[PDB]
Short mmCIF file of C-alpha atoms and ligand atoms in Angstrom, two decimals:
data_model
loop_
_atom_site.label_atom_id
_atom_site.label_comp_id
_atom_site.label_asym_id
_atom_site.label_seq_id
_atom_site.Cartn_x
_atom_site.Cartn_y
_atom_site.Cartn_z
CA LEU A 1 0.00 0.00 0.00
CA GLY A 2 1.34 3.34 -1.12
CA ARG A 3 0.23 6.83 -0.23
CA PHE A 4 0.26 10.15 -2.03
CA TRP A 5 -0.83 13.64 -1.03
CA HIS A 6 -3.05 15.73 -3.29
CA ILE A 7 -3.12 19.42 -2.45
CA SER A 8 -4.61 22.27 -4.44
CA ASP A 9 -5.80 25.85 -4.41
CA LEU A 10 -3.53 27.23 -1.70
CA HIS A 11 -4.18 30.81 -2.94
CA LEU A 12 -1.78 32.85 -0.81
CA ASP A 13 -2.95 36.34 0.04
CA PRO A 14 0.41 38.11 0.55
CA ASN A 15 -1.22 41.08 2.21
CA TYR A 16 -3.31 39.26 4.84
CA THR A 17 -2.93 41.25 8.05
CA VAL A 18 -4.78 41.10 11.35
CA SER A 19 -5.88 44.73 11.25
CA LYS A 20 -8.32 46.82 13.25
CA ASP A 21 -9.60 48.18 9.90
CA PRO A 22 -12.00 45.51 8.50
CA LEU A 23 -11.37 46.72 4.94
CA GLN A 24 -7.58 46.33 5.20
CA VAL A 25 -7.37 42.73 6.43
CA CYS A 26 -7.09 41.05 3.06
CA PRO A 27 -7.45 42.39 -0.52
CA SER A 28 -8.91 39.02 -1.53
CA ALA A 29 -12.10 39.92 0.39
CA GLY A 30 -12.73 42.88 -1.92
CA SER A 31 -15.06 45.36 -0.26
CA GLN A 32 -16.47 42.81 2.23
CA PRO A 33 -15.73 43.91 5.82
CA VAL A 34 -13.59 41.34 7.64
CA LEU A 35 -14.45 41.61 11.33
CA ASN A 36 -12.11 40.36 14.10
CA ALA A 37 -9.80 38.52 11.70
CA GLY A 38 -7.73 35.70 13.15
CA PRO A 39 -4.14 34.57 12.58
CA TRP A 40 -4.92 31.44 10.59
CA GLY A 41 -7.23 33.08 8.05
CA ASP A 42 -10.81 34.19 7.57
CA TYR A 43 -13.62 32.66 5.53
CA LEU A 44 -13.81 35.87 3.44
CA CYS A 45 -10.07 35.83 2.62
CA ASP A 46 -7.57 33.79 0.73
CA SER A 47 -4.92 32.00 2.79
CA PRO A 48 -2.41 33.81 4.98
CA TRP A 49 1.07 32.39 4.81
CA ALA A 50 0.54 31.01 8.32
CA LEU A 51 -2.27 28.80 7.02
CA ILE A 52 -0.31 27.50 4.04
CA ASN A 53 2.68 26.80 6.27
CA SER A 54 0.42 25.01 8.74
CA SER A 55 -1.01 22.84 5.95
CA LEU A 56 2.42 21.64 4.81
CA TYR A 57 3.56 20.81 8.33
CA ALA A 58 0.26 19.03 8.94
CA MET A 59 0.97 16.88 5.90
CA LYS A 60 4.43 16.12 7.25
CA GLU A 61 3.02 15.09 10.62
CA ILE A 62 0.39 12.81 9.02
CA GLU A 63 2.59 11.22 6.33
CA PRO A 64 6.18 12.48 6.03
CA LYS A 65 7.24 9.90 3.42
CA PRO A 66 4.52 9.75 0.77
CA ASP A 67 5.35 7.97 -2.46
CA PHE A 68 4.80 11.34 -4.19
CA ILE A 69 2.73 14.53 -4.00
CA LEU A 70 0.23 15.85 -6.54
CA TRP A 71 -0.05 19.64 -6.52
CA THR A 72 -2.68 21.07 -8.86
CA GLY A 73 -2.03 24.79 -8.58
CA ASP A 74 -3.78 28.12 -7.93
CA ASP A 75 -1.26 29.89 -5.72
CA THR A 76 -2.16 33.58 -5.95
CA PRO A 77 -5.04 35.58 -4.49
CA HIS A 78 -8.42 36.54 -5.93
CA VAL A 79 -7.63 40.20 -6.65
CA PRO A 80 -7.65 42.40 -9.78
CA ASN A 81 -4.88 41.84 -12.29
CA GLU A 82 -3.57 45.35 -11.56
CA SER A 83 -2.84 44.21 -7.99
CA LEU A 84 -0.86 41.13 -9.06
CA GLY A 85 1.69 41.44 -11.87
CA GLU A 86 3.95 38.83 -13.40
CA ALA A 87 6.82 39.26 -10.93
CA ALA A 88 4.50 38.75 -7.95
CA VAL A 89 2.87 35.71 -9.56
CA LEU A 90 6.25 34.10 -10.14
CA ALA A 91 7.52 35.05 -6.67
CA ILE A 92 4.45 33.47 -5.09
CA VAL A 93 4.78 30.25 -7.09
CA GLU A 94 8.44 30.13 -6.07
CA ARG A 95 7.67 30.70 -2.38
CA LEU A 96 5.15 27.84 -2.31
CA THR A 97 7.47 25.59 -4.33
CA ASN A 98 10.29 26.28 -1.85
CA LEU A 99 8.04 25.44 1.11
CA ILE A 100 7.12 22.07 -0.41
CA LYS A 101 10.81 21.39 -1.16
CA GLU A 102 11.74 22.34 2.41
CA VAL A 103 9.13 20.17 4.12
CA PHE A 104 9.38 17.23 1.67
CA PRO A 105 13.00 17.42 0.43
CA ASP A 106 13.19 13.84 -0.85
CA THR A 107 9.72 13.58 -2.38
CA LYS A 108 8.78 13.62 -6.04
CA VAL A 109 6.13 16.24 -6.79
CA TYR A 110 3.91 16.33 -9.86
CA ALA A 111 2.75 19.92 -10.22
CA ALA A 112 0.25 21.59 -12.54
CA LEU A 113 -0.42 25.29 -12.98
CA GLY A 114 -3.79 26.68 -12.01
CA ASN A 115 -5.75 29.41 -13.72
CA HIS A 116 -4.59 32.07 -11.25
CA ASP A 117 -0.92 31.12 -11.73
CA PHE A 118 -0.54 33.59 -14.59
CA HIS A 119 -0.68 37.28 -15.30
CA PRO A 120 -3.19 38.23 -16.56
CA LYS A 121 -5.26 35.61 -14.75
CA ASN A 122 -6.69 32.80 -16.88
CA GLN A 123 -4.87 33.94 -20.06
CA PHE A 124 -2.76 30.83 -20.56
CA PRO A 125 -1.13 30.81 -24.03
CA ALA A 126 -0.80 27.76 -26.23
CA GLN A 127 2.90 28.53 -26.62
CA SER A 128 5.97 29.30 -24.59
CA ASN A 129 6.19 32.45 -22.49
CA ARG A 130 8.10 33.81 -19.49
CA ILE A 131 5.82 32.15 -16.95
CA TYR A 132 6.06 28.66 -18.41
CA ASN A 133 9.81 29.13 -18.78
CA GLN A 134 10.39 30.32 -15.22
CA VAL A 135 8.08 27.75 -13.66
CA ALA A 136 9.94 25.05 -15.58
CA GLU A 137 13.08 26.28 -13.81
CA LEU A 138 11.37 26.20 -10.39
CA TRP A 139 10.07 22.66 -10.98
CA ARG A 140 13.15 21.35 -12.77
CA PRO A 141 14.21 18.99 -9.92
CA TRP A 142 10.87 17.24 -10.41
CA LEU A 143 10.99 17.03 -14.23
CA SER A 144 12.80 14.75 -16.66
CA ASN A 145 14.64 16.42 -19.53
CA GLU A 146 11.70 15.59 -21.78
CA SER A 147 9.18 17.03 -19.33
CA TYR A 148 11.25 20.18 -18.81
CA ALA A 149 11.18 20.84 -22.57
CA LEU A 150 7.45 20.10 -22.78
CA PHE A 151 6.69 22.31 -19.80
CA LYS A 152 8.37 25.32 -21.40
CA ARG A 153 6.12 24.96 -24.45
CA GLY A 154 2.73 24.20 -22.91
CA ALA A 155 2.93 23.53 -19.14
CA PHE A 156 2.01 19.87 -19.64
CA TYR A 157 4.15 16.73 -19.38
CA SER A 158 4.19 13.12 -18.22
CA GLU A 159 6.48 11.32 -15.77
CA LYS A 160 7.11 7.69 -14.88
CA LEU A 161 6.40 6.96 -11.23
CA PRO A 162 9.50 5.68 -9.41
CA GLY A 163 9.54 2.42 -7.49
CA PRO A 164 8.09 0.73 -5.64
CA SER A 165 5.20 1.52 -7.99
CA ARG A 166 5.37 -1.27 -10.55
CA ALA A 167 4.34 0.36 -13.81
CA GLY A 168 2.81 3.78 -13.29
CA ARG A 169 2.85 7.15 -14.96
CA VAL A 170 1.49 10.60 -14.06
CA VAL A 171 0.15 12.83 -16.81
CA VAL A 172 0.08 16.51 -15.91
CA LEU A 173 -2.28 18.69 -17.96
CA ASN A 174 -2.65 22.40 -18.55
CA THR A 175 -6.46 22.54 -18.61
CA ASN A 176 -6.33 26.33 -18.24
CA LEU A 177 -6.06 26.21 -22.04
CA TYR A 178 -9.74 25.20 -22.10
CA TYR A 179 -11.29 27.74 -19.73
CA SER A 180 -13.93 29.80 -21.50
CA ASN A 181 -12.42 32.99 -20.00
CA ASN A 182 -9.06 32.28 -21.67
CA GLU A 183 -8.98 34.49 -24.76
CA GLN A 184 -5.58 33.15 -25.84
CA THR A 185 -7.09 29.87 -27.06
CA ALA A 186 -10.34 31.16 -28.57
CA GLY A 187 -10.86 29.55 -31.94
CA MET A 188 -8.24 26.79 -31.46
CA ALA A 189 -9.48 23.22 -31.77
CA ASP A 190 -6.48 21.65 -29.97
CA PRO A 191 -4.45 24.40 -28.29
CA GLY A 192 -0.83 23.36 -27.88
CA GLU A 193 -1.78 20.01 -29.42
CA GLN A 194 -2.43 18.83 -25.88
CA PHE A 195 -5.30 16.50 -26.80
CA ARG A 196 -3.27 14.87 -29.59
CA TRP A 197 -0.31 14.52 -27.20
CA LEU A 198 -2.53 13.12 -24.45
CA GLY A 199 -3.95 10.44 -26.72
CA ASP A 200 -0.46 9.51 -27.83
CA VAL A 201 0.79 9.25 -24.23
CA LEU A 202 -2.16 7.08 -23.31
CA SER A 203 -1.68 4.86 -26.36
CA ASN A 204 1.96 4.47 -25.34
CA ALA A 205 0.87 3.55 -21.81
CA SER A 206 -1.34 0.76 -23.17
CA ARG A 207 1.51 -0.51 -25.35
CA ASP A 208 3.94 -0.39 -22.44
CA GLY A 209 1.72 -2.03 -19.83
CA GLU A 210 1.47 1.10 -17.68
CA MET A 211 -1.42 2.61 -15.73
CA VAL A 212 -1.79 6.38 -15.54
CA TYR A 213 -2.93 9.05 -13.11
CA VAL A 214 -4.11 12.21 -14.91
CA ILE A 215 -3.94 15.51 -13.01
CA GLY A 216 -4.89 19.05 -13.82
CA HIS A 217 -6.38 22.19 -12.38
CA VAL A 218 -9.67 23.08 -14.16
CA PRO A 219 -11.98 20.05 -14.53
CA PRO A 220 -14.40 19.30 -17.37
CA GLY A 221 -18.07 19.32 -16.51
CA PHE A 222 -20.03 21.53 -14.18
CA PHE A 223 -19.65 23.17 -10.77
CA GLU A 224 -21.86 21.45 -8.19
CA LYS A 225 -22.39 24.60 -6.08
CA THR A 226 -24.53 26.23 -8.77
CA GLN A 227 -26.47 25.43 -11.94
CA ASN A 228 -25.27 25.54 -15.55
CA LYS A 229 -21.65 26.62 -14.79
CA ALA A 230 -19.03 24.81 -16.85
CA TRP A 231 -15.44 26.03 -17.12
CA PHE A 232 -14.45 24.38 -20.39
CA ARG A 233 -15.66 25.62 -23.74
CA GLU A 234 -18.10 23.04 -25.08
CA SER A 235 -15.81 21.68 -27.81
CA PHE A 236 -13.01 21.10 -25.29
CA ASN A 237 -15.42 19.39 -22.89
CA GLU A 238 -16.47 17.06 -25.73
CA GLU A 239 -12.88 16.28 -26.66
CA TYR A 240 -11.90 15.55 -23.06
CA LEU A 241 -14.79 13.10 -22.80
CA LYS A 242 -13.75 11.47 -26.07
CA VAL A 243 -10.24 10.89 -24.69
CA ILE A 244 -11.57 9.26 -21.51
CA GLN A 245 -13.98 7.10 -23.50
CA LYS A 246 -11.16 5.87 -25.76
CA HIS A 247 -8.42 5.47 -23.16
CA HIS A 248 -10.15 4.69 -19.84
CA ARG A 249 -8.60 1.23 -19.50
CA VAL A 250 -5.17 2.75 -18.80
CA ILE A 251 -6.43 5.60 -16.59
CA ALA A 252 -6.44 4.57 -12.92
CA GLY A 253 -7.47 7.98 -11.59
CA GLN A 254 -8.01 11.64 -12.37
CA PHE A 255 -7.20 14.34 -9.82
CA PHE A 256 -8.34 17.96 -10.23
CA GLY A 257 -8.99 21.08 -8.17
CA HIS A 258 -10.34 24.59 -8.97
CA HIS A 259 -13.67 24.22 -7.19
CA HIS A 260 -12.19 24.32 -3.64
CA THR A 261 -15.03 21.94 -2.65
CA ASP A 262 -14.98 18.16 -2.29
CA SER A 263 -16.80 16.24 -5.01
CA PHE A 264 -16.22 13.65 -7.72
CA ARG A 265 -17.19 13.04 -11.34
CA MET A 266 -18.30 9.77 -12.91
CA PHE A 267 -17.55 8.86 -16.52
CA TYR A 268 -19.67 6.35 -18.45
CA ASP A 269 -19.44 4.75 -21.89
CA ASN A 270 -22.18 4.39 -24.48
CA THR A 271 -23.24 1.08 -22.92
CA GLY A 272 -23.83 2.79 -19.58
CA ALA A 273 -20.81 1.17 -17.98
CA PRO A 274 -18.94 3.29 -15.44
CA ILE A 275 -15.46 3.70 -16.90
CA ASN A 276 -13.59 6.26 -14.78
CA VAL A 277 -13.77 8.62 -11.83
CA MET A 278 -12.30 12.05 -11.22
CA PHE A 279 -11.66 13.21 -7.66
CA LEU A 280 -12.07 16.95 -7.04
CA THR A 281 -10.07 17.77 -3.97
CA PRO A 282 -10.92 20.73 -1.73
CA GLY A 283 -8.72 23.78 -1.34
CA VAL A 284 -6.48 24.98 1.43
CA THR A 285 -7.90 28.47 0.91
CA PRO A 286 -11.24 28.99 2.73
CA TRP A 287 -12.20 32.01 0.58
CA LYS A 288 -15.92 32.61 0.19
CA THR A 289 -16.46 32.52 -3.54
CA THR A 290 -17.74 35.58 -5.38
CA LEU A 291 -19.24 33.46 -8.16
CA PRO A 292 -22.69 34.98 -8.73
CA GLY A 293 -25.52 32.98 -7.24
CA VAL A 294 -23.45 30.95 -4.76
CA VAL A 295 -24.62 31.68 -1.20
CA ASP A 296 -22.14 31.39 1.65
CA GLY A 297 -19.63 29.55 -0.56
CA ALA A 298 -16.72 29.28 1.88
CA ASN A 299 -14.97 26.10 2.98
CA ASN A 300 -12.66 24.96 5.71
CA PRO A 301 -9.03 24.40 4.64
CA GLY A 302 -8.56 20.83 3.40
CA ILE A 303 -5.74 18.44 2.44
CA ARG A 304 -6.00 14.88 1.15
CA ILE A 305 -4.13 11.61 1.10
CA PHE A 306 -4.83 8.68 -1.23
CA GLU A 307 -3.97 5.07 -0.49
CA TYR A 308 -3.20 3.01 -3.61
CA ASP A 309 -1.95 -0.39 -4.76
CA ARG A 310 1.60 0.13 -5.97
CA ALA A 311 1.34 -2.83 -8.37
CA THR A 312 -1.77 -1.66 -10.29
CA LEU A 313 -2.46 1.98 -9.29
CA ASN A 314 -5.90 0.86 -8.06
CA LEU A 315 -7.16 3.43 -5.58
CA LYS A 316 -7.88 1.86 -2.22
CA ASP A 317 -9.04 4.85 -0.16
CA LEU A 318 -8.74 8.50 0.47
CA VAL A 319 -8.64 10.44 3.73
CA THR A 320 -9.42 14.14 3.78
CA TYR A 321 -8.09 16.23 6.67
CA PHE A 322 -9.16 19.73 7.60
CA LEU A 323 -8.60 22.72 9.79
CA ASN A 324 -11.78 23.94 11.49
CA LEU A 325 -10.95 27.58 10.92
CA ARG A 326 -13.50 29.00 13.35
CA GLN A 327 -12.02 26.87 16.15
CA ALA A 328 -8.38 27.29 15.13
CA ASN A 329 -8.66 31.05 15.31
CA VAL A 330 -9.33 30.93 19.06
CA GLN A 331 -6.32 28.64 19.69
CA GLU A 332 -2.56 29.07 20.01
CA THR A 333 -1.66 26.58 17.29
CA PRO A 334 -3.83 25.30 14.42
CA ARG A 335 -4.38 21.54 14.70
CA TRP A 336 -5.62 19.64 11.68
CA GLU A 337 -7.90 16.63 12.09
CA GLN A 338 -9.30 13.82 10.01
CA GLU A 339 -12.52 14.83 8.28
CA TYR A 340 -13.41 11.45 6.79
CA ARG A 341 -12.15 8.24 5.23
CA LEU A 342 -13.96 7.51 1.96
CA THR A 343 -14.56 3.79 2.50
CA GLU A 344 -16.18 4.55 5.88
CA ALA A 345 -18.25 7.52 4.66
CA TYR A 346 -19.83 5.59 1.77
CA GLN A 347 -19.53 2.02 3.07
CA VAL A 348 -17.63 0.85 -0.01
CA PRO A 349 -14.60 -1.46 -0.21
CA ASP A 350 -12.22 0.85 -2.06
CA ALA A 351 -12.12 3.96 -4.29
CA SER A 352 -12.59 2.06 -7.57
CA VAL A 353 -14.98 3.21 -10.25
CA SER A 354 -17.56 0.66 -9.06
CA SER A 355 -17.26 1.93 -5.48
CA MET A 356 -17.67 5.55 -6.55
CA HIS A 357 -20.69 4.59 -8.62
CA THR A 358 -22.16 3.02 -5.48
CA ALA A 359 -21.34 6.20 -3.56
CA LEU A 360 -23.22 8.28 -6.10
CA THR A 361 -26.22 5.97 -6.07
CA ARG A 362 -26.34 6.28 -2.26
CA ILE A 363 -25.96 10.06 -2.37
CA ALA A 364 -28.86 10.17 -4.84
CA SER A 365 -31.16 7.87 -2.85
CA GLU A 366 -30.40 8.06 0.90
CA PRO A 367 -30.98 11.35 2.74
CA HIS A 368 -28.31 10.72 5.34
CA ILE A 369 -25.65 9.96 2.71
CA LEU A 370 -26.63 13.01 0.68
CA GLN A 371 -26.22 15.14 3.80
CA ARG A 372 -22.89 13.53 4.70
CA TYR A 373 -21.56 14.21 1.19
CA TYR A 374 -22.95 17.75 1.38
CA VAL A 375 -21.28 18.57 4.69
CA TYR A 376 -17.98 17.24 3.36
CA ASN A 377 -18.46 19.24 0.16
CA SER A 378 -17.64 22.48 2.03
CA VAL A 379 -15.01 20.70 4.17
CA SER A 380 -17.51 20.68 7.04
CA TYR A 381 -18.09 24.45 7.01
CA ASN A 382 -21.82 24.41 6.28
CA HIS A 383 -24.12 22.01 8.15
CA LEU A 384 -27.47 23.22 6.82
CA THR A 385 -29.63 20.62 5.12
CA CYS A 386 -29.14 20.02 1.41
CA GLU A 387 -32.71 20.34 0.11
CA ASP A 388 -34.23 19.36 -3.23
CA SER A 389 -32.57 21.94 -5.50
CA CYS A 390 -29.21 21.42 -3.80
CA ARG A 391 -29.59 17.66 -4.28
CA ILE A 392 -30.27 17.94 -8.01
CA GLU A 393 -27.37 20.37 -8.55
CA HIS A 394 -24.93 18.00 -6.89
CA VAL A 395 -26.24 14.71 -8.27
CA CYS A 396 -26.38 16.04 -11.82
CA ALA A 397 -22.87 17.51 -11.65
CA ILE A 398 -21.42 14.26 -10.26
CA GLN A 399 -23.16 12.08 -12.84
CA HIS A 400 -22.99 14.19 -16.02
CA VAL A 401 -19.84 15.76 -17.37
CA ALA A 402 -21.43 16.13 -20.83
CA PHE A 403 -23.28 19.40 -21.44
CA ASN A 404 -26.49 18.00 -22.91
CA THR A 405 -27.07 15.22 -20.39
CA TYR A 406 -26.28 17.54 -17.50
CA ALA A 407 -28.90 19.96 -18.87
CA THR A 408 -31.53 17.21 -19.11
CA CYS A 409 -30.74 15.95 -15.62
CA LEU A 410 -31.37 19.44 -14.21
CA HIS A 411 -34.98 19.24 -15.48
CA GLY A 412 -35.58 16.63 -12.75
C1 LIG B 501 5.43 7.33 -27.43
O1 LIG B 501 6.54 6.44 -27.38
C2 LIG B 501 7.57 6.71 -28.34
C3 LIG B 501 8.57 5.59 -28.24
O2 LIG B 501 8.02 4.41 -28.81
C4 LIG B 501 8.16 8.07 -28.06
O3 LIG B 501 9.09 8.33 -29.11
C5 LIG B 501 10.36 8.75 -28.63
O4 LIG B 501 10.32 10.10 -28.25
C6 LIG B 501 11.57 10.58 -27.73
C7 LIG B 501 11.32 11.98 -27.20
O5 LIG B 501 10.98 12.91 -28.23
C8 LIG B 501 12.63 10.50 -28.82
O6 LIG B 501 13.88 10.85 -28.23
C9 LIG B 501 14.38 12.09 -28.77
O7 LIG B 501 15.10 11.84 -29.95
C10 LIG B 501 15.63 13.01 -30.59
C11 LIG B 501 16.31 12.54 -31.87
O8 LIG B 501 17.38 11.68 -31.46
C12 LIG B 501 18.21 11.25 -32.56
O9 LIG B 501 18.40 12.29 -33.53
C13 LIG B 501 19.13 13.47 -33.09
C14 LIG B 501 19.29 14.35 -34.32
O10 LIG B 501 18.94 13.56 -35.46
C15 LIG B 501 20.47 13.08 -32.46
O11 LIG B 501 21.03 14.25 -31.90
C16 LIG B 501 20.26 12.03 -31.37
O12 LIG B 501 21.51 11.72 -30.71
C17 LIG B 501 19.54 10.80 -31.95
O13 LIG B 501 20.41 10.25 -32.94
C18 LIG B 501 16.60 13.72 -29.60
O14 LIG B 501 17.03 14.95 -30.18
C19 LIG B 501 15.90 13.99 -28.26
O15 LIG B 501 16.77 14.65 -27.29
C20 LIG B 501 15.88 15.23 -26.28
O16 LIG B 501 16.18 14.79 -24.97
C21 LIG B 501 17.56 15.07 -24.50
C22 LIG B 501 17.56 14.98 -23.00
O17 LIG B 501 17.28 13.66 -22.59
C23 LIG B 501 18.10 16.47 -24.91
O18 LIG B 501 19.52 16.38 -24.98
C24 LIG B 501 17.53 17.04 -26.22
O19 LIG B 501 17.73 18.44 -26.26
C25 LIG B 501 16.05 16.73 -26.36
O20 LIG B 501 15.38 17.40 -25.25
C26 LIG B 501 15.26 12.71 -27.69
O21 LIG B 501 16.30 11.80 -27.31
C27 LIG B 501 12.73 9.09 -29.38
O22 LIG B 501 13.58 9.09 -30.53
C28 LIG B 501 11.36 8.55 -29.77
N1 LIG B 501 11.46 7.15 -30.14
C29 LIG B 501 10.88 6.61 -31.22
C30 LIG B 501 11.11 5.15 -31.42
O23 LIG B 501 10.19 7.27 -31.98
C31 LIG B 501 7.05 9.11 -28.12
O24 LIG B 501 7.55 10.39 -27.75
C32 LIG B 501 5.91 8.75 -27.18
N2 LIG B 501 4.83 9.70 -27.37
C33 LIG B 501 4.49 10.61 -26.45
C34 LIG B 501 3.42 11.56 -26.85
O25 LIG B 501 4.99 10.62 -25.34
C1 LIG B 502 -0.09 44.01 -1.67
O1 LIG B 502 0.40 45.31 -1.45
C2 LIG B 502 1.38 45.68 -2.43
C3 LIG B 502 2.08 46.93 -1.95
O2 LIG B 502 2.87 46.63 -0.81
C4 LIG B 502 4.19 47.22 -0.89
O3 LIG B 502 5.08 46.49 -1.73
C5 LIG B 502 5.36 45.11 -1.36
C6 LIG B 502 6.36 44.57 -2.38
C7 LIG B 502 5.85 45.02 0.09
O4 LIG B 502 7.10 45.66 0.20
C8 LIG B 502 4.87 45.75 1.03
O5 LIG B 502 5.43 45.74 2.32
C9 LIG B 502 4.67 47.21 0.55
O6 LIG B 502 3.78 47.93 1.40
C10 LIG B 502 0.68 45.89 -3.75
O7 LIG B 502 1.68 46.22 -4.72
C11 LIG B 502 1.45 47.49 -5.34
O8 LIG B 502 0.22 47.52 -6.08
C12 LIG B 502 -0.02 48.81 -6.68
C13 LIG B 502 -1.38 48.74 -7.33
O9 LIG B 502 -2.41 48.85 -6.35
C14 LIG B 502 1.10 49.14 -7.68
O10 LIG B 502 0.89 50.45 -8.18
C15 LIG B 502 2.46 49.06 -7.00
O11 LIG B 502 3.50 49.20 -7.96
C16 LIG B 502 2.62 47.72 -6.28
N1 LIG B 502 3.89 47.67 -5.57
C17 LIG B 502 4.83 46.76 -5.83
C18 LIG B 502 6.09 46.85 -5.01
O12 LIG B 502 4.68 45.90 -6.70
C19 LIG B 502 0.03 44.58 -4.17
O13 LIG B 502 -0.82 44.81 -5.28
C20 LIG B 502 -0.80 43.94 -3.04
N2 LIG B 502 -1.04 42.54 -3.37
C21 LIG B 502 -2.24 42.02 -3.61
C22 LIG B 502 -2.25 40.57 -3.95
O14 LIG B 502 -3.28 42.68 -3.53
C1 LIG B 503 5.49 26.91 10.01
O1 LIG B 503 4.88 25.89 10.80
C2 LIG B 503 5.82 25.22 11.65
C3 LIG B 503 5.08 24.08 12.31
O2 LIG B 503 4.06 24.54 13.18
C4 LIG B 503 6.40 26.21 12.65
O3 LIG B 503 7.46 25.54 13.33
C5 LIG B 503 7.21 25.44 14.72
O4 LIG B 503 7.55 26.65 15.33
C6 LIG B 503 7.35 26.66 16.75
C7 LIG B 503 7.68 28.06 17.21
O5 LIG B 503 8.87 28.54 16.62
C8 LIG B 503 8.22 25.60 17.41
O6 LIG B 503 7.88 25.51 18.79
C9 LIG B 503 8.01 24.23 16.76
O7 LIG B 503 9.01 23.34 17.22
C10 LIG B 503 8.11 24.33 15.24
N1 LIG B 503 7.77 23.04 14.63
C11 LIG B 503 8.47 22.48 13.64
C12 LIG B 503 7.96 21.15 13.16
O8 LIG B 503 9.46 23.02 13.15
C13 LIG B 503 7.00 27.42 11.94
O9 LIG B 503 7.35 28.40 12.91
C14 LIG B 503 6.03 28.01 10.93
N2 LIG B 503 6.68 29.05 10.15
C15 LIG B 503 6.09 30.22 9.85
C16 LIG B 503 6.89 31.16 9.01
O10 LIG B 503 4.95 30.49 10.23
ZN1 ZN B 504 -8.68 28.10 -6.85
ZN1 ZN B 505 -8.80 27.70 -10.22
#
């Protein structure tokens, strides 16, 4: 049994300050007054350094010798572009990179850029640029020569897992190329040729007897905290689905972030068979989202470990840990705790596709399992009851990555 951490959406707010002025605590809160801010963060703000530092040392306490770490990006705060230029973006990515290197000096890390890890935000080019070049330098100890060259061109690459994993590979995507707010890739069918490359990597994996973990920042499909919100342009969503449908037999897991909330996505083939699952890990940042229509969309800080079979990459379990921010802020030191173990929460034997399908069916049919999933969705921040419209928004997002079937499901 191996273990790996998955962390995402740290979103440092460099200017977080415990201030007597509620409008000068954190620029990431915008114009929202931040009353009696605490040292470990605030639900209206992105993460203070103290919180990010606490999260890394919590990971070290829980599992100091993981087989590897997956890090799916989003390092900078939710502020206007004019507040956050290229030098600051790169300095922030470097500071977080250095913290991970300091706390886990002997650990391989597979890192993807998130949509905020660029200036201007979301405008990821399908070609080389100063940010891809400098991040390749920061992540060079983690990249093969081939991956270093690929990263400079498109911020995507693939790496063979080291032993004792028998025959595994991690594929790291730049899914920021597909975000509808990214004007750099408007009108491009296959920006950076990433889909062509991905298919080729996965065909090679089948030839070579390897199983693959696919990671990225922005997921396909819809955001479960609202209705009708997809990040990918429709054509990219369709292409991503086509890749999974063709190559699922070599894909042992998909690991994404961006939402900051804890959910998962099922993939099915045209016979109705479940063929893959994507795990959307929560964020370290607690920041209450400004996405229109989302009420009280904050979360507790979360981190996650997966347990896996080193011989096959089959996922055996996951454990999500959290910091109860409201409690931590009245205490001298933040102490992270176990939120849940997946097999226990859903009463399933492992984290296989069949087990996740069972989890969904229970979420969709048993009130107490729906509510359990819902509480965990915000990392145990919000305990109000998930009522009928909440249920449909979550169930449809989990079940339907495709635009048209998601739309039909929402009619329920
Ligand atoms: C699916 O699987 C296939 C294998 O079946 C992969 O194909 C291999 O891809 C690699 C990577 O591109 C190829 O290796 C590269 O070969 C280049 C050419 O090498 C010859 O020719 C040059 C000039 O003619 C000579 O200089 C050289 O000595 C050889 O005679 C090299 O230029 C490449 O160098 C790269 O890596 C090193 C660092 O390790 C750097 O020094 C270079 O700057 C450069 O970064 C590299 O060695 C290999 O030839 C391919 N094999 C076959 C059989 O085709 C596919 O890539 C894979 N598909 C995907 C999508 O992953
Ligand atoms: C955070 O505040 C900085 C300004 O802080 C000063 O510069 C830092 C480098 C550091 O030395 C602090 O102690 C200083 O008080 C903002 O940076 C400025 O932003 C304005 C635009 O509003 C721009 O005109 C200035 O040139 C910027 N200064 C520098 C040095 O770049 C920064 O935008 C704030 N960060 C966030 C994320 O909101
Ligand atoms: C980052 O977090 C670590 C872990 O909590 C902090 O290190 C602790 O610091 C206290 C006070 O100096 C010591 O009593 C502990 O022994 C330290 N623990 C470890 C494991 O080193 C560290 O101070 C934090 N750094 C920042 C910049 O906040
Ligand atoms: Zn994020
Ligand atoms: Zn994001």
